[PDB]
Structures are given as structure tokens and as C-alpha cells.
Design a protein around this ligand. Sequence first.
Ligand SMILES: Cc1c(F)cccc1[C@H]1COC(N)=N1
Lengths: 281, 229, 338, 57, 127
Amino acid sequence: EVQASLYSLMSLIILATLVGNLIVIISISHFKQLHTPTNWLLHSMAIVDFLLGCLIMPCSMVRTVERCWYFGEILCKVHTSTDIMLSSASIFHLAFISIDRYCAVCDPLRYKAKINISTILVMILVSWSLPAVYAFGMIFLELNLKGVEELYRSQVSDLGGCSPFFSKVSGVLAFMTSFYIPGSVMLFVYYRIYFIAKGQARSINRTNETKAAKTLGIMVGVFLVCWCPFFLCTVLDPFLGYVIPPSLNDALYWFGYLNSALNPMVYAFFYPWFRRALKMV
Amino acid sequence: SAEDKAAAERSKMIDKNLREDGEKAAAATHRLLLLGADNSGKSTIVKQMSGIFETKFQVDKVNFHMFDVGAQRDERRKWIQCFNDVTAIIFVVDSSDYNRLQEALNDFKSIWNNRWLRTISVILFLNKQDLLAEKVLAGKSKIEDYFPEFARYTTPEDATPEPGEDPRVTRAKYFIRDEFLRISTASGDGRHYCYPHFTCSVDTENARRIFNDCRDIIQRMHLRQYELL
Amino acid sequence: ELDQLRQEAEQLKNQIRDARKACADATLSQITNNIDPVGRIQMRTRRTLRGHLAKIYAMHWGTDSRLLVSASQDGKLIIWDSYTTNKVHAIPLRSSWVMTCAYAPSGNYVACGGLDNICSIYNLKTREGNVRVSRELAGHTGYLSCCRFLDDNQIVTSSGDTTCALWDIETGQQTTTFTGHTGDVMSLSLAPDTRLFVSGACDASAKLWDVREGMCRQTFTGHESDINAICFFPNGNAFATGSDDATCRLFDLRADQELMTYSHDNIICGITSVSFSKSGRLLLAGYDDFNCNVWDALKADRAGVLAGHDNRVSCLGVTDDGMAVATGSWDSFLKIWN
Amino acid sequence: TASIAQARKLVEQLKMEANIDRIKVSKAAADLMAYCEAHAKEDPLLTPVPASENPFR
Amino acid sequence: QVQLQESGGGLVQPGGSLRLSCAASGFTFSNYKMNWVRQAPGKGLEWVSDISQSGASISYTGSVKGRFTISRDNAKNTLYLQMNSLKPEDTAVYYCARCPAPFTRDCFDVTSTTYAYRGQGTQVTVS
Ligand SMILES: Cc1c(F)cccc1[C@H]1COC(N)=N1
């Protein structure tokens, strides 16, 4: 019925995420011409998205449909920790890939002196460690639930839900640590890159189109449409009274989950230097 | 098989040295091909720093290596295929001598349309601008004798002449550049571009000009790589 | 008097052509028409030798068929171990513009050269466990295209100054200069008896020379453009040439004329490397269109394509025992096929 | 007068190419065929060797 | 063997015309870009004209535009240079050197001192 149709639509995103990320991981690891340091950010981001689409997204798929968690409080906390970890890691990887294109475009004559294996490994280690520590020290310590425990009990715990709950300070912290700080950097980088590429294209046409819009249009719009609806609503939840229905909250969650499905496409298949290496087989 | 383990370890350390040399080499260091004729002041391009030369200089802590091949014969078609991975070709042209300017144009055309140098962006250096200005001001030799299209030519609206520059001098130098740009834009496609510069034997901004065009070349290469251009 | 000399040269050429036509009783193509085709041969990349950081412009197989030396524009001369992909040595070159390299038949010496006009001999069997410049051979006024070892004492090189030279490594001087080419000499090949060697040049002509006496014996013509590669047929009484006209020509020292034509309307790029396999039945030729086709020398047709390189196949050499063939290229990889 | 010297050198070179005896092209092709047939079994590239003897497996 | 033999030239008064004829045998004439190279007595070789494989990319040096015209006959494997309205500055030896490789739009080396694929040449004298 409706539940089956939703399950099929959601398993579509599950399969898209899994297959798209396996393709990227296998292509980067196996093919050896795609071993530049900038391709390790893509590999790590694909690993993050695969882990999300294999651990959380399939597990939250039944949670959204049934509107009830029946796996215990401990595993509910573990699931929320892994979700926050992997989502923040993916957003951090987007920010660091954007920093890599900023280094490649803005400062071209020192690109290999700034983006090398050591720097890429440092970026990957940060992108994995910081969300992990943040989530597992915020929700296991109940920092997010602190201050609204009594309200949360009746609102979610009495209903047996596993929906993350954020207080006034905790919601702002989650916003500033998963959307604004790792998204304002990306927006600034792509805005600067858009102006630079527009200037270069105009100069080239002067000496002799605008393709910096079909690239930076999707690379920004996918992220915005998939994350902004969730984060702007979640940060306003403490400041509005928690009136948003669970169904719309689930839709906001699965926008962010669809971001992990669209990331492998946008960041690998849009670029011909990846498709050419993929088409050899 | 202990010898096999020893050989494998030696191969690993050798590969480690190769990778270290690769990082320390291909990082803030760019290779350039300094090409020109005997009359052209190719040697006296950058004032600040038996078969092939090598000039090394830095501008913004970025190393540049110019390779001046000055010991082979006049047949250039085979030894020039080695320089198809350089950042740019520093083509130096003597603007004053119009008699050999046509063969300079032919050399530029062959380099531009070469099947291997078709991705290398030429950094054109119109050298001896002072001598060109003196020649055109004296008027003893006329450019329309060696090019029967300079008469039907006007200076471009985008020209930026020196304040102390004669309009005829500006027209002449910009006619030579446009003659080079014509070859450049006839079959330039979008993978390589010509960067013309009017330089003298006294100007010390050749290194900065090379730095800026290499930055532009690499930036456009990266934009094409990330499909932003 | 100059007109008389020109007339003498023209009549000598006419006599040579008439002798060639008279000796052309039949055509090798129709004589070999009775040979059954081998069929499409499949050869796959067995080894991919990565580690070079720039274009690979030349390589040479060892006589042991185990160790191969490769030269790259980055400035390294790696002596690989094809069986185990182990880099036995990685020689740093003073000049990174190396265009050729040879591995001595003994195995204790390796040469390289290029835009530095210098053939640098490297000792791989020193008692101190290192690699050092044994001798800096100088005297060529053009880039070195191909150098080959007669032994640990004599090495013959080809330069871009239209001349080939025979060197004594210990002496360091040109024993004999092989003059007569008009264009840049682009390749070398030594007969199995090492008494004769041919060298294709950038004049659509291949010249047969005698190492002992030091004068040209047979000048071969029949190509439409610059010859880029040349190798002897394993019998030693024939040789093949690859040129920019996208055509390979096989000649005979005895017949002194072109025999066959290895070209197709589908190949447009020129040849950069030619090498018979072990019996002169296979003629592997490396083209600029990123793959090196395999041509049946006897059937004078194409019977295989070796694709897999991302750039120009600059160098192509076969093992002395016929067990493998290596194809270096500008993509910084040597692929060994079998 | 280097031009006449080069012309005379080319004349001598062509003469000493001409006086060289040349066998029949049919004989040369037959010899090449015989060599290839004799060494056909010894060419691993012509006929692939079993993987046991192949050192690049 | 590649061969490039020129027929034409001689002594002509200023303003005269001469149709130089270069016969090129041995190679596929219809497949190579073809040039005309002239060497003034006491000067280095100078490229004076050019054509394409078919004959649509014709280009000239400045000193002869509007005075010389180049034409190629693919079937006859012959190429011409109608040097009409010749001036005293046109006294030189004219070569019909082809280009090093076919299928290419670059003729990288045709005015070299010892180019392999030049013809013998015809001394054109004008007085
Ligand atoms: C709960 C939370 C965060 F605090 C930060 C990022 C992501 C999430 C969840 C909800 O939305 C998605 N896709 N994961």
C-alpha cells in the first residue's frame, strides 16, 4: 500500500547511494591513474556516503515508515551517533573538496605544494574524527537532550521514537557545526570560483559560453536543496516550539540522505576525467 | 627467497626515493621552453636569473626552468617533441627585422599546429620593441613592403599604448601582435592560448610576466579539468 | 664538372634500380601467398611498470630477458625487474632530456643520451654498491637518437647531426664516424653478428654500414617520409623501418631493395618504434595513435593490435628469447605483453 | 668547393652499391620464409607458450 | 625514392612571368602540404609560398602576394608557381620542398639549410 510505495521509493535512494559510492570507491582504489591527492577526498567522501547508505539510511527507512523505534534506547543512541557522524563527515568532505578546487583555481602555481598526500590525509582525518567525537560526546552525554529532558520524554520517548531532539543551545551548535561553518566556506569558495571562471571565459571570448554555471549550479544546488530544508527547520525547532509534524521531519531527514546519493554523481560522473577512466573497462 | 625479500625491500626504498623526488620536483616548479632565432634576444629575456641550457628563477617562491636548446641543427621537427609537457613555450620574436619576421610567423604556426605542441600555450615575447620603434619612426624600411596588408590596418580599440609612444609605433607593434594572434586564434581550439608581450632588452618584468601567464595557463587548465571553462 | 658528377650519380642510381628490377623475378607477397595465416593473436598486459614521473622515451631489454632499462624525461634511468616489477636501480641523470638508452649485453653497463649531446655510460656492477658515470662520451653535434652496445668496450651511437659514431668507452674517442646521411638519424639496429648495422634517418633512407671499415655499404630508399625506427630481421640479412608516412617497409641486404609494405588506410599516425619478435614473422610497430599494431611480416598484413596506452608509444622492444615484448609510452608506464 | 666533393663522394657510394651482387628477390623471400618456418616453433609470440613456461603469468 | 625535380626559370626582364613546374614522384603528392622555398644569392632560404593537401589553405609570403600564384595538380603529381610581374628582388633559386609528414597542418622544417625533401632548384634570374 502506501507503506510499500514509500519503502520502494526509499530503497531506490538506498540502492542509488550504495551503487554510486561503490563505483567511486572501486574506481579510485583500483584504477591507478586516479591516484592524485585530490581523488582521495572523493574516495573518502564516497566511503562516508556508502557507510551512511548502508548503516543509517536503510535503518532509518523503517523508522520513518513505522514512526516507532523497536531496537532499544542504546542502539537508538548508537544509530543517532552514526547518522550525525556520517552526515557531518560528508559535509566536511564537501567543504574540503571545495577547498581543494579553491587551491587549484585561485593559486594554480602552488597547487601541488598545498594539496598533497599529507594535506589530504589531514583533511580526511579531521573529517572523520571531528564529527565522531562531536556526536558521541554530545548525544551519549545527552548534551542535545539537556534542558528539555522532561519535554522530550513525553514528546518522543512516550511514543517510542528515535528522532534526534535538540535544545536551544544544542540546536544552534549542531547548525554551526554541520551546516554553517562547513557550508559557508563552500559557498564562499564556489562564489569566488564562479567569478574567476566567468572572468576567464569572458576574456577567452574577448580574445577570440558560461559553463561555470552548469557545474557550480548543481554542485551548490544539490547540497542546498538536500540540507537547507532540514537544518533551517531543526535550528528553528527550539525557537519555535517543536510544532513540525514527524512526517515533514522525516522528509527533511531524507533530503539529507538523498544528498549522499547525489554526491557521487555530482562529484565524479559530471567530470569527463572520471568517465574516461570508467569507460576503459 | 630471502634474496627475494631483500630485492623487494630495495625496490620499496627506490620507489620511496622516486616519490620524494617527484614531490620535491613537481611542486611550485614549472618547466618552460625558451625558443627563438639567433637574432632574437632569447638569452636576454629574464635579467633576474653543451646541448641544452637551463635557466632557473623564482618570482613568488615558485621555480621556473627555461630550456634553451642551442646546440642541435636547424631541423627542429624531432627534438621539439620532447617539450610537449612544459607549462609554456617562451617564443621570442625580433619585431624589428621584418625580413625574418615571416619565417618567425611560420615557426609560430608550425609550433601552434604541431600535433604534440598543440596543447602548449605559447608565451609570445615581442622582443626589441625599442629597435622596432626606432625603425618605424625613421621610416627607412616600411612594413607594408614585407606585408601588403599593413596599409589596410588600424590599431585595435583595446590597445593600451605607452603615453610616450608614437601612434605609428603602436600601430606597427599591434599589427605584428595581431599577425601572431591570427595564427593563434585560427586553430587555437580551447586547450592552448597565446600570451603576447611587448618587451625590450632593458625591461625586468619578463619574469613577472612569465609568472602571471603561467598562473593563467594553469588556472585555465584547472578550470577545464573541473569543467568550469 | 658538377653536371658530369650529377649525371654519374643518376646513371648509377638507374643501374641500381635496373638491377633491383632484374632481381625482382617474383614478388614476396605472391611468394608468401601459400603461407597459412596465423590468425588474430591476442597479447595482454602481463606487467605494468609504474614509477616514472614523465614521458618514457626509450627502453632496452637485457640479454638475460629479465632486467630492462627505461629512460624518462623526468631524469631517471630505472633498471626494472620485469618478472617481479622490482626496480633494481634508479639512476639519476644529469640531463633529464634523455632520448635513448641501451643495456649492455654483459649487463654491467647502461648507456643513455639525448638533448645533452652526450652518451653517458653507467656502471651497474661497481664494487661499492652504487651507480656512477663510467664515461661521458662527447663529440656528437646533435641529439642522440639511439645507442647500442657491441660489447663492454665498443658502443655505436646515432645522432641528430646526420652521423653515426663508433666509440671506445675506455678511450672515450670516436673510433669511426659514419657519414652519409642527409637528415637526422633516428634509430639504430645491430646485426646479430655485430659486423653490420643499419640506421634510418630523417631523409626517407636507411643506410647499411660496416662497423670495422666504417663506410656506408648499401643505402636503402622507398619511404615517403622521416624514418623513426629500424630493426634487423632475426636472420640478420634483412631489416624493417618505421617512418612518419604511417608505413613500415622491410628491406633485404642481399636484394638491396624494398620487399613489402606494412600500411593500412585506417592508420594515419606515423610509427615511432619497430621490433621483430624472435623469428621475423611478427613485426610490432608503435604508432602515435596510442597503440602499437602487430603486423605479420610474411603476410604483409595486420594481425593484432596492442591497445592500452594513454599516450604515444615512444619505445617498443622484444625480449631476446621471444618470451615477452615491452611497450613504453608517454603515459609514464611500460607495459609488457605476451 | 665542398659541393663537388660531396657529389664525388655520392658517386663513389652509388658505384660501390651498384657493384654489390644482388640475389633474386624470389630467392630472398624464399630464404625469409624458410627462416620463419624453421624458427616458427621457437617463437612464443607467434604461438602462445603454456603458462608454466611463461615467466610473466 | 622520394624525388623533387623542378622545370622552369631562366632570364626574364622585370615584369615578366614564369610558371615554375616541380615534378614530385615517389610519394603520394595528393597527401602532403607543399611549399615553395627560395634562396637569394648571399642570403638564407626563405619560404615564399604554400598550398594545402587539396589547395584551399593557400598562403603566401608578404613580398609576393598579388604577384605569385600556386596551384597543385593531384592527378599529375605536379605543382606550379606562376611568378608573374617579377621584380629584380625576385632573383634567387627556387625550391619546391614538401613537408616532413603527411596528414599534418604543420610544416615544421622546410627552410632549413640541409632539408632532405627539397628539390635541386631552378636559378631564376631577373635583370
Ligand atoms: C540529526 C542530524 C544532525 F544533528 C546533523 C546532520 C544530520 C542529522 C540527521 C538528520 O538529517 C540527516 N540526513 N541525518
